[PDB]
Every structure is written in structure tokens, then in C-alpha cells.
Amino acid sequence: KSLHMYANRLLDHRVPQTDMTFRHVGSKLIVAMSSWLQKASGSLPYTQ
Amino acid sequence: PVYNATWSASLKNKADYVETVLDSTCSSTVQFLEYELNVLGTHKIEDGTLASKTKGTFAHRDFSAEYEEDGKYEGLQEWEGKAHLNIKSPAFTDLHLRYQKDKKGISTSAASPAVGTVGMDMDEDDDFSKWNFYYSPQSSPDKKLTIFKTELRVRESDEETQIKVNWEEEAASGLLTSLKDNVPKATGVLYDYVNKYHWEHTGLTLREVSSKLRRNLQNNAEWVYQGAIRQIDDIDVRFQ
Amino acid sequence: ESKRLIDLSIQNYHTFLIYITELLKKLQSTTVMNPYMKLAPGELTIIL
């Protein structure tokens, strides 16, 4: 519940004159991390 | 002969009440530097309580200031009365300030022809209290835009107490627009003011004086330049 | 330039207050402790 409400807080606020929430930037960084992970050798189901 | 100024003051005791009279005036060869200021205040201490009535009025070319005070002073924390200020400025905008204080309510506001009317009212009572800070638009003196409001309410049932704070974005935005629109209003009055004084003394505008300064700079530059050129021929000829 | 500054100030002030109200509402949803806070657009009420 605490993580849910924190995510709601993060989603619901951003600086004026920009409507892109920081969660999209977080998702972009997560995508980059996942791309690097799949690039990394020694893959395991735990990585999946 | 050029300048004459008189400062007259007098403190007088008349049995039950004191009277304060102040006068000040100046006669000058400068037109906008002559005035007369006057104030009168009667002060009666009745069995320890003070009843106060005073009038202060100013006269000058660019405006006149007129203030009225009335009321009484009980102890050091109970003043009940009214204070009214009215300013008539040909040089700039006029103003009229009204202050009121009763034992259960304080009300005061300022009526400005540029900003409008800005006022605040404090109603105080044992079990409730309310602060109101409102801005009436210059274009609409019939309504009050609540800049902010506070409402203290101690519940007579149970031990709960409510604090209610309210504000209007509309009031703030309207006041900000009025202020940004007021910039040229002050700019023009001050510009015409300085030009008026320049006229009263030398008959020139600020821009006219700037042009005169530029022209004199050019004239002096040529005065230097001609001699600078001539010296070359002088030196050459003497060397020959 | 003065008028432009005041215009931008009003613009960002308005664009910003709504995000603040949303964040405040999400935060108030977090807890229900005995002192009860009620948030409204342009208003806040405090019960003690």
C-alpha cells in the first residue's frame, strides 16, 4: 500500500509547463537497464 | 528674501484637557517648494481614560493631505475610534484610507483609483474568530475577492476545534494583472512630473536637456578637434 | 518586461497550484489518524 501511494504521488505531480511525469523517465532508465542486462553474458532464468 | 520659513508650536493646558497646535510653512523662490502644514489635537484625560480628537491637514502644489482621527484610549490596550485619511494629488493618483476599530470588530480598507479597494476585517469573539483579506477589483467595487480567509471555531460540543483557511486564485491573478497594468500609470506620471519641474525652472523637458547635453558634447568635441589638427601644422612649420 | 514577468508569474502560479493540490490530496489519503485533515481546492480545514 505504501509503495502504491508513493507511486500515485510521483505520477500525480510534475513541474509546470511540462506534462511528462517522471515515471516515464524511470521507465526509460529501466528499459536501458534491461537492454544492458540482456546484452550481459552469463544469462540465467533469475535474470528473466 | 528668497526663502522664508516659519515653525510655530504651542502646548497649552486648559483645566481638564491639553491642546497641541503645530504650524509650519515655507516661502520660496521655487514654486513647487512652498507649503503650509497644520495640525490640531485636543487631549482630555477623563478620570484616567483618554478621549482623543486630532486633525492634520497639509497643503502643497502637488497635493494636499487631510487626516482625521477620533476615539478614546482606555488603558494601554483599548483604543476605540476612527481614523480617516484622504489624499488629493494632482501630481499622482489620489487615495482615501479608512480605519475603524470597535470592541468586537476591526475594519479598514484603502480605496486606490489604480489598484482598487484593498481591505481586511477582523471579527473576534470568544467561541469564534474570522479573518478576511479581500481585494475588490478596480473595475468592480461591488464584490470582494477573498485574497485569504481564516476561520477559528472552537466547538462548544466536545473538545474539537476547526481551523478553516481559504484563498482565491482569482483574487491573486486579478491583483497581479492590476499591478502589471499599473506600471505605465506610475511611469507616465513620474515622467511628466520631472518634465514639469524642468519646465518650471528652465523651461526644458528631460529629453530637451538630454539633447542640449549631447549638442554641447558635440560642440566641445569639435573645439578640441580643430586645435588637435592645427597643432600638427604648427609643429611641422616650426621644424622646417 | 515588467508586465511580461508578471504574466509569466501568473501563468506558472496557476499551472503549479493544481499539481500541488493533487499531491496534497494523495498525501492526505495516506493516513487516517485521529486529527482529521480535509483538503479542498483553494481551501484546507484542520480539526484538532
From Swiss-Prot, chain A:
Coiled-coil region(s): none
Question: At the top level of its lineage, which domain of life is listed?
Answer: Eukaryota
Residues crossing the lipid bilayer are none
Give the protein name, as stated in the record. Apolipoprotein B-48
Q: Which gene encodes it?
A: APOB
